[PDB]
Structures are given as structure tokens and as C-alpha cells.
Design a protein around this ligand. Structure first.
Ligand SMILES: Cc1ncc(COP(=O)(O)O)c(CNc2csc(C(=O)O)c2)c1O
Ligand SMILES: Cc1ncc(COP(=O)(O)O)c(CNc2csc(C(=O)O)c2)c1O
Lengths: 383, 383
């Protein structure tokens, strides 16, 4: 049966990993958040069973997720228009959304930005959905090529899905402005697209509420949308696989009926979701004290990334770069394109032991005050 | 998009739940195992990061799983013929296997026993695989209808998958004898079936090693097989979603190449698996002290089920049943068919508040010395 299977298409790693996918603190570590440890100790002391969760996971987790996404008091919540399934990570949320759409709707294709996270194509294609790309990056001005984006998306037909990164676009760190999000929301309604928000970095651009402004501009204009969110980075819960798939429809009757088929898609995949990480999230978000500790830890990560963006720009200048890298200051989240070519990136790894991805994307959160000077010296050497 | 979606096809519950899917102790509780609490305290004290696991999960978890399945010193392990991916539960292992097979092999159909766990059909159909049924149950003799099974499976073609419950068949509790497993292994080789073992109850029939005898008889005769295993019941870790998909091929080169595509199927589903529950398993299985506490806790669950099987048979007689229920003593695991009809089961729920599934399957682990007498009185009343 297996003898003819084709193989599927860090190890190589004063050397430095900017190819990492995770947050690192100033010491180069990815520690467990203190809020998370406190919540884990509470669960150890208080859990009396590991009995299965419902298919959609812990109810409080769903409520707290919807409030993060839509705002406390949003009409979507008051009108019972949204249902949330706790999932194994943001990836699991994307796949649940893809399976739900493939089996229950006429969707055949999903539009993704060029560039995006490379696993988007794999997830949607696994569910039998075609992926098409829309233009996104203006490399000359280090910017969102908004005209190109709108022009590309003219090819999208009514009933296609269009995937939007809610904030901290991966890999570019370039997000629509609020007015651009409002333009896209109106366009989406007029053209009949189903928006799919992928929200893996809420809190890493400007703040929890500000980072959800784009999603909320969409939610104010659409009867229907899906959000696949992740708590991997903003709780540092990567390996516990904590995410959510939130379905929104015109009314409660419709969302509940549609959500029954989303639950069927989950039940045929992994049955019901892993409790530990989501229970840590729900414990923290529903407790004033733990929530305040967690919000500060997330602010500290957001701010450290900001400081590294500024220090990187200042240092490249001091090590003799010459080039404008000011665009880095304005970009959001852990990632940016450095503007290095694939060969410069290869040189960086081979000659200098500095790792980035071939696109030139760098994880700013891999930079620290201690490694900044060698890092920038290496980059200057390959310009 | 969603307005036309059709709805997908405990709540109703001296009343008694035999419709439950979980183990209950003598007090009617499903507590966290002591070995599990001890391991969770160790992880709270010792974990320093939640950084993502590899796609296939924790290496020690995989090694300990293969030793449970195949035996320490098995040739499959020595020859590096098996690869294990840690998955979100036994369901996740089944779905990973189904996606792997659908995308990478000529498999189009999977043979499942009639009866089986109802989610088997949903998982395989979700991956685009047809499900066909083979005969299994001799209800007159309360037994495995082995001739019917072999006759049904004659319709299976070379390259079809045949799913076997490794022990504690769900719902019947009727397992092949060792010699029957040996007959099926030889038949499977001759007919070109790919065996898929679903092993959710290892340790609940006779013991860890004895319960794997059937799988090991297959493994001794086949170049290729897949095992989807679960630690939900034997560690009481239901909601932490702890299972494994183990791929076996003729040699290391082939299994590694095939496993790369299994990892691709995982990466497009949930990316990488949830650490907490699997880390508890690996912590326990790799530690002599915790392993001994856990093995005794599992023996205690196995034995309590045995005691309830005997007490149920004895009590039905004492409450005036008359019928032979001796078959219950011989069956394995938490489940058996009571031999009640769908209408007797409905009567039991409506008139007596005793819940079972419509097939008449009962969870023996829902029985306790305290509820046995009313339970049996109710059953006698509906005969
Ligand atoms: C846009 C987008 N969507 C979904 C995800 C998946 O989140 P999790 O599955 O890890 O929770 C992620 C993040 N997952 C991720 C891990 S490493 C990484 C990277 O791009 O380096 C990305 C993401 O960036
Ligand atoms: C034969 C078989 N295969 C797979 C599974 C899935 O295990 P988990 O996904 O829960 O780990 C199970 C058990 N899962 C399960 C939960 S309730 C239940 C039942 O039949 O009542 C069954 C099983 O019996």
C-alpha cells in the first residue's frame, strides 16, 4: 500500500534565529506566562474530572472569545448571531471552517493574500477548496498595495471566501488602516464575498480592542462571517492548541442551524477539543485579577517588539547600512519583510549564522538588546 | 451563504445513566486519576515553555506508545518499521489515518463491523472514504458470528482497509479469541487488506499485554498496518485529547517516507498536537513509580467492571429475570448489548428513568453496588 508514496516536500540552526515562529523575551526564552502558571495551579487544585467537553468546548471560553472579537455589548452578541467552537489552535479553527464550508455550502475557493502564512493553502486545499491569491505588498513604499489588492479581488466571484488577517499580517506586518478596512467591508458586501478572518495575533499590533477594529467594521456590515482565532501567541500557549472558530449568521435561528453542521465537522475530525489550554484561557479571561496580569504580560510582549523594531532601525544605521529601514517601525507584530533577497538571506545563514526565511521575513521578537549589534553588522555586510 | 443549510441530525437525563460513554467509579464519579494528578503537578513545577511540539508530538510519547502496542523488544520497533504521531484523541488518530489514506493511497473504502462506534462512518466519510459493513454479532449465542464475519469480508477487495477493534469491541464487548485473531491475520494477508486497528480500551479486557495479542498477531504477519489508539479511557484523560496514529511499513525507508505524508495531513488539520495530556502520559509511562501507580489504577477500573458484570448477572436473577444473562460475564470492557429491544430501552427511560442507547448497549461501568438493585428491578419489569 505504501511502497510508492512520494515524500512530502531549525536543524541547520554568535548565531541567531529570526526564523523562529514564536515570541522570545529579552533573554531569548519563550517562558510560560505567569498568568498561565497561576491558572494551571488553580486547575490542578480544582479539577475533579477529565470528562469530555461538548463538541464546541468550554462555554465560558466561547463567551470570552466573542467578547474579545466583537466587544462587550456588541449587537452580534446581544442578538445571538455568533456561535463559537473551541478548537485545537488557530490551524484547527481554519480547518474546521474549511470542512464546514466545503460540505455545507457552495464555496469552492478561498482568496488569500500574496504573501501569507504558507499553511493557509495546505489547510484549504485539504478540505477540497481551491486557493487564489490577491495582491497585497507594495515593496517600493513598504506598504499595502491597496489598489492592487482591490484590483485582484475584482476577480473574486459572489460566494467566494476572502481571507483577511485581522491584525499583524503574517509575513509582512502591514495591516489595513481603519478606513481601508471600512472600504474593504463595503466592497465585500457589494461583491458577495464571505469574509474569513484569521486572527492569530490579537493584542500584538496596538491593543486588544484596536486590533479588532477591522473585524468589527466587517461585522457591522455583514450578515455572515467566520473568524478563526488563536491564543497560541497572545497567551504563549502554542503547544496546548487553543483557538476558536466563530460562525456569524443573520440571526440566531440560522447560526444555530449552521453551527450544528460545524459541530458535525468537528465530531468527524477530533470529536471534541483539548481542555487544558482553553480552560487556562477561560480561567484567566473570566477572572478580574488573572485577566489584569495577563493583559499586562501581553502589553509587555507588544511593547518589547516595538522596542526591538526601533532598536533594529537605529542599529542598522549605526552599523553602516545607509538604506531607509524606517518602514520597520510602522509595521505590526512579530514579523516584517527585511527587504533582503533570498540570496542575501542564504548568505546571512551561511556566512554569519543569522537565520531568516527565504522571503526575507524576520521575527523581530527574536531580536534582543544583546544580539542586535552582531545581527545588524551581519545584515550590513550582505547589503 | 448559510441561510439554506440543513441542521445536522444526556439532556433528557433514582434515575441511572448507562448511556454514559465514560468510566465511573463505585461512587458514580469520573475522577482524575491519582497518577495523572501527580504527573500534572510535576509538569506545573517543571515546564518552562509552551513552545510548539513537532508535528508528530512528544518523542517519548511515541516510544512508550509503540512499546504498549507491540511489546518491548518487538521486531517492528527494533527494525524501525513504525512511526507514531501523537494526535488529539483516538478520533483524531482515525481522521489522520483516513486523510493520509485518502490522499496518498488507492484506498477507497474501509470495512467496519456491524455494529460499531457510530462515529467511525462519519470520520471515514469526512475524508471521502466509503464505509462498508461486515457481519460480527451472533445474538442467539451472544457471541462473535465468526462465520458470518469471514463470509462478509469475502466481498472486501485487495487494497481495501479493514477496521478491527483491538479489544473491548464497542458496542458488544465481544472480541476475537487469540486463535480467531490468528485466522483473521492470515486471511488479511492472503486477501490484501490493509488492517486498521482502533485501540481505545487497552487494559480494560484482561490486561495491557493480553489486550494487544490480536494486534501483535497481525503485526507478526503484515508488512503494513495502521493503529489508531486512545488514552482517553485507560488514563481517564478524555478531555485532554490524547491518542496516537501509528503507521507500520515494510522497512524504515518506506515508513519514514510514508510518515512524511502523514505529518503533512496533520499540518493541514491542526498543525501539531496538544501537549498537556500526552505529556502526562509520557511522564507516567516513562517513570517506574508513576507507571506502577497508573497500572494499578487501570487494573482497579478493569476489575470493578468485572465485578459489575458478575453483580449484574447475579442481581437480575435475584430480581426475577429468569433469562440467561451469563454472556455478560464473558464480555470485555465497559459495554455490552443487554439484549433489550429499542422499545424496552425506551420504556426503561420513560417508566423507570434508566438510560441506555436504543441498541440496548449498556455501560457496565455506570453500574454500582448502590444502583444495581433498582436497575435490575427496572429491567425485569420490561422483560
Ligand atoms: C496567520 C496565521 N494563521 C494561523 C496561525 C495558526 O495558529 P496556531 O495553529 O499555531 O494556533 C498562525 C500562527 N502559527 C504560526 C506558528 S509559526 C508561524 C510563522 O509564520 O512563523 C505561524 C498564523 O500566523
Ligand atoms: C471504538 C472507539 N474508537 C474510537 C474512540 C475515540 O476515542 P477518543 O477520541 O475519545 O479518544 C472511542 C471512544 N470514544 C467514545 C467516547 S463515548 C463512546 C461510546 O461509544 O459511548 C466512545 C471508541 O470507543
Amino acid at each position: 500500500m505504501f511502497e510508492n508514496i512520494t515524500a512530502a516536500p531549525a536543524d541547520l540552526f554568535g548565531k541567531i534565529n529570526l526564523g523562529i515562529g514564536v515570541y522570545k523575551d529579552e533573554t531569548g526564552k519563550t517562558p510560560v506566562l505567569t498568568s498561565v502558571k497561576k491558572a494551571e495551579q488553580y486547575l490542578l487544585e480544582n479539577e475533579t474530572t477529565k470528562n469530555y467537553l461538548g463538541i464546541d468546548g468550554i462555554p465560558e471560553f466561547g463567551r470570552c472569545t466573542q467578547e474579545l472579537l466583537f466587544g462587550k455589548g456588541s449587537a452580534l452578541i446581544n442578538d445571538k448571531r455568533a456561535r463559537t467552537a473551541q478548537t485545537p489552535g488557530g490551524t484547527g479553527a481554519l480547518r474546521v471552517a474549511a470542512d464546514f464550508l466545503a460540505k455545507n455550502t457552495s464555496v469552492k475557493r478561498v482568496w488569500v493574500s500574496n504573501p501569507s502564512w504558507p499553511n493557509h493553502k495546505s489547510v484549504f486545499n485539504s478540505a477540497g477548496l481551491e486557493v487564489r491569491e490577491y495582491a497585497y505588498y507594495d515593496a517600493e513604499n513598504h506598504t499595502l498595495d491597496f489598489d492592487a489588492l482591490i484590483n485582484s479581488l475584482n476577480e473574486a466571484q459572489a460566494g467566494d471566501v476572502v481571507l483577511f488577517h485581522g491584525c499583524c499580517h503574517n509575513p509582512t506586518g502591514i495591516d489595513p488602516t481603519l478606513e481601508q478596512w471600512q472600504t474593504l467591508a463595503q466592497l465585500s458586501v457589494e461583491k458577495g464575498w464571505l469574509p474569513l478572518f484569521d486572527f492569530a495575533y490579537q493584542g500584538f499590533a496596538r491593543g486588544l480592542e484596536e486590533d479588532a477594529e477591522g473585524l468589527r467594521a466587517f461585522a457591522a456590515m455583514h450578515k455572515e462571517l467566520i473568524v478563526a482565532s488563536s491564543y497560541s501567541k497572545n497567551f504563549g500557549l502554542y503547544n496546548e492548541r487553543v483557538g476558536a472558530c466563530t460562525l456569524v449568521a443573520a440571526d440566531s435561528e440560522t447560526v444555530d442551524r449552521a453551527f450544528s453542521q460545524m459541530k458535525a465537522a468537528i465530531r468527524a475530525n477530533y470529536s471534541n477539543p483539548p481542555a487544558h489550554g482553553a480552560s487556562v484561557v477561560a480561567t484567566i479571561l473570566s477572572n478580574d485579577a488573572l485577566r489584569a496580569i495577563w493583559e499586562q504580560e501581553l502589553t509587555d510582549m507588544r511593547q518589547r517588539i516595538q522596542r526591538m523594531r526601533q532598536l533594529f532601525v537605529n542599529t542598522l544605521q549605526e552599523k553602516g547600512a545607509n538604506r531607509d529601514f524606517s518602514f520597520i517601525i510602522k509595521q505590526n507584530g512579530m514579523f516584517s519583510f527585511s527587504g533582503l533577497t533570498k540570496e542575501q538571506v542564504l548568505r546571512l545563514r551561511e556566512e554569519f549564522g543569522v537565520y531568516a526565511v527565504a522571503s526575507g521575513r524576520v521575527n523581530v521578537a527574536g531580536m534582543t538588546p544583546d544580539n542586535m549589534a552582531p545581527l545588524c553588522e551581519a545584515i550590513v555586510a550582505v547589503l
